[PDB]
Amino acid sequence: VDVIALGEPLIQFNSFNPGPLRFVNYFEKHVAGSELNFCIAVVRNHLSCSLIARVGNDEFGKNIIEYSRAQGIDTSHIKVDNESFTGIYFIQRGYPIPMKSELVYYRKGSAGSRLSPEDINENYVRNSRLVHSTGITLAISDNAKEAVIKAFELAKSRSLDTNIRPKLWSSLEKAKETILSILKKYDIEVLITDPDDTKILLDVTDPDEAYRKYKELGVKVLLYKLGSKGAIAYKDNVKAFKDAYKVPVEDPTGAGDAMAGTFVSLYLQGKDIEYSLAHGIAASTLVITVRGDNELTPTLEDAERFLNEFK
Amino acid sequence: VDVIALGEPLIQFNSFNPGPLRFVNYFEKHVAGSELNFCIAVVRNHLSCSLIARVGNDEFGKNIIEYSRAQGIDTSHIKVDNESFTGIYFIQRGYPIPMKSELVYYRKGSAGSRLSPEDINENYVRNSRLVHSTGITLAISDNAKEAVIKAFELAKSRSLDTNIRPKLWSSLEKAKETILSILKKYDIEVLITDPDDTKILLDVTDPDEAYRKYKELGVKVLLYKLGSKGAIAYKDNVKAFKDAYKVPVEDPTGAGDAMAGTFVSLYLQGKDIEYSLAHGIAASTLVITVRGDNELTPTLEDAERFLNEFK
Amino acid sequence: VDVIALGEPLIQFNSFNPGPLRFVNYFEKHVAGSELNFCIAVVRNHLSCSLIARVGNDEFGKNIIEYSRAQGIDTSHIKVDNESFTGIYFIQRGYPIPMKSELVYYRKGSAGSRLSPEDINENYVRNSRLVHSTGITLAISDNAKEAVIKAFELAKSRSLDTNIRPKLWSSLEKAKETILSILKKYDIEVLITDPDDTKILLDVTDPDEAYRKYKELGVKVLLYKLGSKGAIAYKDNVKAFKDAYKVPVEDPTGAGDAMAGTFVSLYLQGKDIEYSLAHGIAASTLVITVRGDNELTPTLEDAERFLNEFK
Amino acid sequence: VDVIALGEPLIQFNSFNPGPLRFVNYFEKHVAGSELNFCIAVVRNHLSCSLIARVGNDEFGKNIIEYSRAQGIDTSHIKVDNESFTGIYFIQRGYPIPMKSELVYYRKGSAGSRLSPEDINENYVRNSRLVHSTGITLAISDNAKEAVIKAFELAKSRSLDTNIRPKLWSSLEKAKETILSILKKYDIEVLITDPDDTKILLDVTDPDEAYRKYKELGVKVLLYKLGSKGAIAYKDNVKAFKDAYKVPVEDPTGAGDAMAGTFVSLYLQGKDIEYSLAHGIAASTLVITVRGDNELTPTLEDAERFLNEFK
Amino acid sequence: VDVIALGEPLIQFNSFNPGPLRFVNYFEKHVAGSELNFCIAVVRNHLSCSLIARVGNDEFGKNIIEYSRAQGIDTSHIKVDNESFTGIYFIQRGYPIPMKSELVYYRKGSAGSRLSPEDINENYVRNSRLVHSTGITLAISDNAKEAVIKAFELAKSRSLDTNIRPKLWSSLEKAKETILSILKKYDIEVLITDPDDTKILLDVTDPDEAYRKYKELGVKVLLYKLGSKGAIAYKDNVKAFKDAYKVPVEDPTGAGDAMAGTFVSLYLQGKDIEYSLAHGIAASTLVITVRGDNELTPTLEDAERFLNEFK
Amino acid sequence: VDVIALGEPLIQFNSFNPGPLRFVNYFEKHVAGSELNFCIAVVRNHLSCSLIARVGNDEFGKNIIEYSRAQGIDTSHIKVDNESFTGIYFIQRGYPIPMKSELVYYRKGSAGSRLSPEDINENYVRNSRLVHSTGITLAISDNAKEAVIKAFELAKSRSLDTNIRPKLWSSLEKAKETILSILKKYDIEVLITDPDDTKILLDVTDPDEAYRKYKELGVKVLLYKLGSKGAIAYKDNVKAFKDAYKVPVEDPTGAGDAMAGTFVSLYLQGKDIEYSLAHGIAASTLVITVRGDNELTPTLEDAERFLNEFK
């Protein structure tokens, strides 16, 4: 496989309409989770991609496997764990901030949080081009963190999305120490991050200065996500910026994962960072127009149509 | 009780999609009515609020009372009237004017229209901090109008939303004479109005001139709603303006009630007009994004988050 | 025209699910009204049919005329009345009695209740083969009852469905008096009734005895509805019985009208009572399987298929 | 308050259609939980009823409080616990057994499982007529079990539903020991149970013999639920049996709680066990016709209509 | 009749949400077809309009005739053809280009494609004021194209919408040849077109130059659609421009037909090009806010309201 | 592979509610087609199953392949054909025959109809345990028929479901001659049929006599479907019968495919005809309770639970 990702796939329940969850009567089910969304983007851009994860021995774990198979993700290393349940979350949409979403997790002690070094096979990982994980996987348990540290030991090249979700950590100081340890121990081929995470990790906001400090930490390429203001990619002395597009927002959840998987998979195929960035932006624009996170992540050719035709 | 509101609560039937009602196949039920929406906003800002009203002895009247109880409204004075039915209305959305709604009422001779001076106990009304009603209550019947005049005599302080709904009156001249008469008779702590109503009452639309005239009529605080152009509040020699926010409109119905009840309730607890105004606009912004009038009216704390975070 | 029916067409709102209306959140709209449902069955059996009625100058009245025109009913005598509104009703399904429907009307002083003798043209009525109405039209106002009396005086032949809805009458004695009076003044070529109505009109429930007593009042054909125990038709001392079919009941409202319009239009065309009865039973069976009253009313050829194939 | 119940209220998510959850795209939200359903039945039969429970400081906990308030349950002793989350469950309907349901819980370490003796106020409990709880509350944590043991120490009279849900216990032997300890320590005024539980607790099936053995344990009245075969009530030398009714089943979850709360609240008002049983059966018939557990639980008067009119 | 249109009416299936069709689970049905949409606008502006077409002897063909009859279109020349089926299409919305729709047709060899010169009666056509068709009808088969040629030879006056749908033609050259040929043979009183079609037909996109070239081909009035930049109408060296309104786009399909039918029916009635253009813009604005093509097409009086009140 | 099936997979559009399609507004999409449904049942009983088929190069063809992959079907021989489209059909439910469905096809000249002998590789087919097809595949085109005859020559063993769909054939005589010719040419391990087909093929309906005749034709096991009267299986001198279960019917479409694929797959793995039959009926019972054909086809273990528990 070209790309191996480590994480916890989840079931997402989205309210049918905006508003506090206590007034929501209906919920639509989607398959999501940060690294799963990312894998969908990698496979849409025509690389093979394997998710290493656990699911519970239950309907929702089967849902995750079948969905992933349907979408062309290698599912051989999604292990069923009879010892716990498949994690899920709910999205509260547009309240109290319109066009934004808030996640309510039911995932503590889930089968996905039991991901562990035992699941990481030396030979398997060495025969891939790139290993990806995120700060979510580093947060969910000590053994998921140690799975990432092992997989990153064995990898030929690594990507990391900082993705700090404060609800998943005991403190921001714990998040910071955990993530910086990773950056200090390993070279990172593509780091994906944003102003909020970078303020916690480096205490800087300016993207030019963020790249200078991340580069010191061993990062080669930085994808710096600015949301409604676009995104910036850095590599060596190239800086590429691409503005966001205006579209009606249904749910922005997972937009960042679509952008990151698209960017990384194109970068891996030898596309330059300007092309990979513009495609990451096309992908993150399409997925926000619907409740689900990854159904609208474009293939390479569809993102090229979007880029040539939409304004 | 902090606030007493007098009015006719109603069941609202909202079209599932925009267009002329003859093409609408599905309707979503909401509990609404202008003073009910107002009371929901009062209790969201942490004041006690009692609605004095009648409902029919039917499922829709039980719906109104249970929903109000759920939301922390004091329902001790919503009385069940066996002689008549609970009034309802339908909303036609987006036709012939996009992003606007038209109401089709089935409330002639309803239970709520039977609200009368006998429902207004002198000691109960004296033991409240403020009494609120609207031009809709002044229109629904002569006895409901007299209930309002009686409650206003008895109140420590008063608020009035002029809310002229031409379909509820025999003529605009009648509307004008009825509301002007109430304004001349009483000091009004907070008057809520808009250009359309003020053109009828005062033959002016310029906000500064409307304030000048309402002030001589004994209005202390004026809230002047300009819809997509925002809103203005005046008190003494101070004027606050906040513009509207751009959000996708599902249904604006009840948005002025969310603004009024939020403004009045915060003003009553000592907040300045700028704060009460900005929270008013936040409340009105949230509710227009969904079908239904009051589910998304924010608490004081949620409206602060909205004002701090939404751009 | 072959058949003229006099009545008040209405908009019906159905819940999706059983239960008390205060817990129902969504309603589905259907065009209905007992005589409108009857006319749909007449035209499905290939006779021309004109409904004499009023509707309001409002979207629901336009919905009724457009819907009737869609289904082949002559709408040239459905009058728009700008002085009042189109009546409507809600159905509460399965509570507190499973598989039974209860109607909640908003029709008082409606446009339809203003049907009057002025709306009945002597020449137009004398040119039809048969005039039909029901005890609902007799109940809605004194002027509607007078419209029926006038149309029956002019008619070549008549049909009447007793359809006593106690909620529509000041007393059962009033319903009894009014319906008996029509039976004493006119020959009735087809009377449609049931044990509940007949117990009121005659103090009889036994079908054979009901025929004898109605035949003594000048009724030629009796159609006697036994719901889940089938129906029986009588003409000239000959009885025809057809058993009901077992299907899941979604909503029985209007199933009698489908049966009546089907039976009468076939009878008028020269079909025997056995054939017309079996077709009426087919029509009632299909209608009760869905929430609408008349969309599933079969054409003559589809009812023959039902009878030849369904068991 | 007449009745105090101890338990964990929950949010229920029901699939819109039958089938394995991995193929379900939509879920409808209801407020449920065994003792909450029971309280709804008590309040419908006109006794006051207090639920002692915890909910999390989250949208779903608020939902539970507001719903309960709407329905007339005393909510003063539903405590918000900021330390954990409100439990929820999903219902898989009609697969692999048609017309049956299976529950998938997300409730471990929930705020409801933290119910504890500290929540049980000596004075409060002594001033009620009856304390109810179930084998579910005894299973969810050691401290919820000790809350029940304390509340049962202080009670004037007690009801217990055995309700053994094997998924909630480490073994059936643990369930048996826990429940029998309760029966051995305390007199039980009404025990509610069924063949499955009684086989675990007493190793008997025959209901006549079940009553003989339960009576030895201090039980006064036994309600013995037989599902599709009806139910039996025993008191002293009275045995009452009432057959089930045939209705279309949408979801039987909570039917047993409707029957138990109805039975117990009527028994408390001095109705004999034949009347209380027939009403329990009417209540359990209505709730199975819809997805939710308690919206259709009848009041006393509605259950009397059902009993006199339905067959 | 005032207006005769020749075309193929169709059933449209819309997804609820953006995205590729393979992830859409629910489709909403609408009756549509470019000339049917045009006829609805003609009748909304109070002229009589007859659609000459074929449909299949199937439920979808009956849906088309009943729907057309509901809306006031003369359906006497919508022929049922038992040799083939009613054509349909699906719309894929917002993917890969947000706010754009793509049609997926199932119409090959349909009943509608068998429209032929035999269906065109000399006397009937000579009795109308104007005949309309589009480049879609020219594309569907050689016999449909010959039907248009015959109707145009007989017509008192003509309207044509170029509406080039490349998927319906063997080549763009074929579309160009066929449409130019019609323009060379006949005077056209109203040509409706846009920059994409005009670039093909004339190698011009500039509106003023388009008018000059079309005027040289015998076109009297040019209506030139610029989508989000408005529309322009030309007659006798006079230009009228009307800017578009900003509304959320649900589905633009058929918005051109609403504009064209509205513009042409007003023009025919003696309205000037400025008034007819502003009304056409009102009609297109309303249609694009919903999934259907023609339900929101306004009457003349509602379009005047839109123009006087909407900003 | 254990089983190879030859056929045309299709997209099914199921009406959201019963009735004539002209009144249906919403359609739910399912992936179906008789041999696809069959293959789902094979892989649910733990045998590998490959479908040989063509789909179009369109969204609906990608839908079919992804869904099949999700469900564990080997999709290596579902080939994408750019020359044509993926066939679809609509289901009209409950009209004119309650609890039955009618299919309206849009599949003439589809990609799937282009299945041909060139798709059938001799070595691939020889390396499977059994080949299955149906009378539908024999009907869709001459080349698809020849694909089946070629695959059957090559197979180690064969199964055939006669499945005569009169709408897919030029005459019943053609159906008869085509299927009889296949039966005379080949031994058939399992023939699945029913009275309607057997009356056409053999001019008998008596199950024992049908077995006698099919046995001389070289059929080893006969599965004879009697619908609501259950089903019979025969092998040698043994006959098993299982009656149907009473469940609410949503859509019976595909129920015979669930039965056939379940029976064949269990029979192939050594289960006796009683076991294969009872599991067949369980599968068919589950699927008729929902719209959609194959989602509720049980695994071997779930069907055992059904047989052990459902009464």
DSSP string covering chain A: --EEEE---EEEEEESSSS-GGG--EEEEEEE-HHHHHHHHHHHTT--EEEEEEEESSHHHHHHHHHHHHTT-B-TTEEEETTS---EEEEEESSSSTT-EEEEEE-TT-GGGG--GGG--HHHHHTSSEEEEEHHHHHH-HHHHHHHHHHHHH-SSEEEE----GGGSS-HHHHHHHHHHHHHHS-EEEEEE-HHHHHHHHS---HHHHHHHHHHTTEEEEEEE-GGG-EEEEETTEEEEE-------S--TTHHHHHHHHHHHHHHTT--HHHHHHHHHHHHHHHTTSSSSSTTPPPHHHHHHHHHH--
The closest alpha carbon to D8, from D70, D59, D68, belongs to D68
CA distance A68 to chain F (A): 8
Report whether F80 contacts F55 (CB < 8 A). yes
> Touching check for B66 and chain D: CB below 8 Å?
yes
The burial of D167, by beta-carbon neighbours within 10 Å (0-12 exposed, 13-18 middle, 19 or more buried), is given as exposed
CA distance B249 to chain E (A): 9
Own/partner contacts of E81-85, CB < 8 Å, gap of 24 or more, are E81/E54, E81/E55, E81/E56, E81/E57, E81/E111, E81/E114, E82/E56, E82/E57, E83/E111, E83/E114, E84/E56, E84/E109, E84/E110, E84/E111, E84/E113, E84/E114, E85/E56, E85/E58, E85/E60, E85/E110, E85/E111, E85/F106
The residues of E carrying an active-site annotation are 257
Own/partner contacts of A173-180, CB < 8 Å, gap of 24 or more, are A175/A135, A175/A139, A175/A200, A176/A200, A176/A201, A178/A135, A178/A138, A178/A139, A178/A145, A179/A135, A179/A138, A180/A217
Strand order in the sheet with E158-161: E78-81, E49-56, E3-6, E130-134, E158-161, E188-193, E219-225, E231-235, E238-242
- Which residues, in sequence order, are CB contacts of E301 under 8 Å at separation 6+? none
CA distance E230 to chain F (A): 33
The closest alpha carbon to F64, from F83, F81, F46, F47, belongs to F81
> Touching check for A24 and chain D: CB below 8 Å?
yes
Rg (CA), chain A: 18
> Touching check for B226 and chain E: CB below 8 Å?
no
Query: How many Å apart are CA E9 and CA E293, to the nearest integer?
Result: 12
Report whether F133 contacts F6 (CB < 8 A). yes
Is the peptide bond preceding residue E96 cis, with omega within 30 degrees of 0?
Answer: yes
Q: What distances in angstroms separate CA E82 from CA B66, E114, E283, F140, F293, one per listed residue?
A: 57, 11, 35, 21, 30
Query: How many Å apart are CA A267 and CA A249, to the nearest integer?
Result: 28
Beta bridge partners of D192: D161, D223
Question: What CATH number does the domain containing B41 carry?
Answer: 3.40.1190.20
Provide, as residue numbers in chain A, all residues whose Cβ is less than 8 Å from the Cβ of F67. 70
Query: Structural domain of residue B28, as residue ranges?
Result: 1-311
Q: Which of E20, E106, E109 sits opposite F59 (nearest CB)?
A: E20
DSSP states of C85-112: ---EEEEEESSSSTT-EEEEEE-TT-SG
**What single letter denotes the amino acid at residue C274?**
E
Provide, as residue numbers in chain B, all residues whose Cβ is less than 8 Å from the Cβ of D69. 69-70
Angle between the N-to-C axes of helices C34-44 and C255-268, in degrees from 0 to 180, rounded to the nearest 10: 40
Provide, as residue numbers in chain F, all residues whose Cβ is less than 8 Å from the Cβ of D94. 286, 289
> Touching check for C70 and chain E: CB below 8 Å?
yes
Q: What distances in angstroms separate CA A175 from CA A139, A162, A182, A201, F175, one per listed residue?
A: 7, 9, 11, 8, 71
Q: Are strands C26-32 and C49-56 parallel, antiparallel or unpaired?
A: unpaired
Angle between the N-to-C axes of helices C34-44 and C59-70, in degrees from 0 to 180, rounded to the nearest 10: 20
Q: What distances in angstroms separate CA D296 from CA C20, C28, E1, F271, one per listed residue?
A: 7, 20, 57, 46
Report whether D161 contacts D37 (CB < 8 A). no
Structure tokens at C85: 């509104």
What is residue C74's DSSP assignment?
B
The burial of A48, by beta-carbon neighbours within 10 Å (0-12 exposed, 13-18 middle, 19 or more buried), is given as middle
3-state DSSP assignment of residue C197: helix
Structure tokens at A281: 């932006």
- Which residues, in sequence order, are CB contacts of C203 under 8 Å at separation 6+? none
CB neighbours (10 Å) of residue D5?
A: 31
Burial A164-176 (b: 16+ CB within 10 A, else e): beeebbeeeeebb
Query: How many Å apart are CA E72 and CA E92, to the nearest integer?
Result: 30
Query: How many Å apart are CA F311 and CA F299, to the nearest integer?
Result: 19
Does the distance separating the beta carbons of C70 and E69 come in below 8 Å?
A: yes
PDB resolution in Å: 2.0
Interface test with E, best of B23, B95, B247, B249 (most E CBs within 10 A): B95
> Touching check for E96 and chain F: CB below 8 Å?
no
Longest dimension (CA), chain D: 52
CA B67, B72, B73, B76 dihedral sign is positive
Query: What phi and psi values does residue F297 have, to the nearest 5 degrees?
Result: -60, 120
- Look at the block and give the residue holding tokens 């002692």: D52
Query: How many Å apart are CA C46 and CA D21, to the nearest integer?
Result: 48
Report whether D38 contacts D260 (CB < 8 A). yes
Report whether F172 contacts F164 (CB < 8 A). yes
Query: How many Å apart are CA F66 and CA C79, to the nearest integer?
Result: 56
| Element housing D3 (H / E) | strand D3-6
Report whether E51 contacts E75 (CB < 8 A). yes
Angle of CA points A228, A231, A237, to nearest 5°: 155
Q: How many residues does the structure list for chain A? A: 311
Report whether A264 contacts A37 (CB < 8 A). no
Is the peptide bond preceding residue E298 cis, with omega within 30 degrees of 0?
Answer: no
State the alpha helices, DSSP H only, in D142-233: 142-154, 172-185, 195-202, 207-216
Strands (E), chain F: 3-6, 10-15, 26-32, 49-56, 78-81, 88-93, 101-106, 130-134, 158-161, 188-193, 219-225, 231-235, 238-242
3-state DSSP assignment of residue D219: strand
| Element housing C159 (H / E) | strand C158-161
CA B28, B31, B32, B38 dihedral sign is negative
CA A38, A39, A44, A45 dihedral sign is positive
Query: What phi and psi values does residue C73 have, to the nearest 5 degrees?
Result: -80, 140
Query: How many Å apart are CA D40 and CA D36, to the nearest integer?
Result: 6
Angle of CA points F191, F196, F201, to nearest 5°: 60
DSSP states of chain E: --EEEE---EEEEEESSSS-GGG--EEEEEEE-HHHHHHHHHHHTT--EEEEEEEESSHHHHHHHHHHHHTT-B-TTEEEETTS---EEEEEESSSSTT-EEEEEE-TT-SGGG--GGG--HHHHHTSSEEEEEHHHHHH-HHHHHHHHHHHHH-SSEEEE----GGGSS-HHHHHHHHHHHHHHS-EEEEEE-HHHHHHHHS---HHHHHHHHHHTTEEEEEEE-GGG-EEEEETTEEEEE-------S--TTHHHHHHHHHHHHHHTT--HHHHHHHHHHHHHHHHTSSSSSTTPPPHHHHHHHHHH--
Does the distance separating the beta carbons of A28 and D29 come in below 8 Å?
A: no
| Element housing C79 (H / E) | strand C78-81
Report whether E219 contacts E183 (CB < 8 A). yes
Does the distance separating the beta carbons of D19 and F296 come in below 8 Å?
A: yes
Query: How many Å apart are CA B297 and CA B68, to the nearest integer?
Result: 14
**What single letter denotes the amino acid at residue E68?**
S
- Which residues, in sequence order, are CB contacts of A50 under 8 Å at separation 6+? A1, A3, A4, A5, A39, A73, A74, A76, A77, A128
The burial of F49, by beta-carbon neighbours within 10 Å (0-12 exposed, 13-18 middle, 19 or more buried), is given as buried
Q: Which of A24, A60, A104 sits opposite D22 (nearest CB)?
A: A60
What is residue D164's DSSP assignment?
-
Does the distance separating the beta carbons of F97 and C309 come in below 8 Å?
A: yes
Q: Method of determination? A: X-ray
CA distance C221 to chain F (A): 28
> Touching check for C21 and chain B: CB below 8 Å?
yes
Does the distance separating the beta carbons of F94 and C290 come in below 8 Å?
A: yes
Report whether F272 contacts F233 (CB < 8 A). no
Residues C43, C48, C54, C58, Cα dihedral to 10°: 60
Q: How many residues does the structure list for chain F? A: 311
Longest dimension (CA), chain C: 51
Residues D299, D302, D308, D310, Cα dihedral to 10°: -110
Q: What distances in angstroms separate CA D279 from CA D163, D207, D248, D268, one per listed residue?
A: 20, 20, 19, 14
Query: How many Å apart are CA C29 and CA E56, to the nearest integer?
Result: 29
> Touching check for E236 and chain B: CB below 8 Å?
no
The closest alpha carbon to D152, from D174, D135, D137, D132, belongs to D132
Query: How many Å apart are CA E143 and CA E114, to the nearest integer?
Result: 7
Query: How many Å apart are CA D105 and CA D88, to the nearest integer?
Result: 6
**What single letter denotes the amino acid at residue E252?**
P
3-state DSSP of chain B? CCEEEECCCEEEEEECCCCCHHHCCEEEEEEECHHHHHHHHHHHCCCCEEEEEEEECCHHHHHHHHHHHHCCCECCCEEEECCCCCCEEEEEECCCCCCCEEEEEECCCCCHHHCCHHHCCHHHHHCCCEEEEEHHHHHHCHHHHHHHHHHHHHCCCEEEECCCCHHHCCCHHHHHHHHHHHHHHCCEEEEEECHHHHHHHHCCCCHHHHHHHHHHCCEEEEEEECHHHCEEEEECCEEEEECCCCCCCCCCCCHHHHHHHHHHHHHHCCCCHHHHHHHHHHHHHHHCCCCCCCCCCCCHHHHHHHHHHCC
Q: Are strands B78-81 and B188-193 parallel, antiparallel or unpaired?
A: unpaired
Tell me how many residue pairs between chain D and chain F have CB atoms under 8 A apart. Answer: 37
Report whether C86 contacts C58 (CB < 8 A). yes
Q: What distances in angstroms separate CA A15 from CA A95, D90, D92, F250, one per listed residue?
A: 11, 16, 19, 27
The closest alpha carbon to C227, from C259, C262, C203, belongs to C259
Query: What phi and psi values does residue D191 have, to the nearest 5 degrees?
Result: -105, 135
Q: Are strands D219-225 and A78-81 parallel, antiparallel or unpaired?
A: unpaired
- Look at the block and give the residue holding tokens 């149509």: A305
End-to-end CA distance of chain C: 36
Report whether B250 contacts B291 (CB < 8 A). yes
The closest alpha carbon to C107, from C15, C32, C208, C26, belongs to C32
Domains held by chain D: number: 1
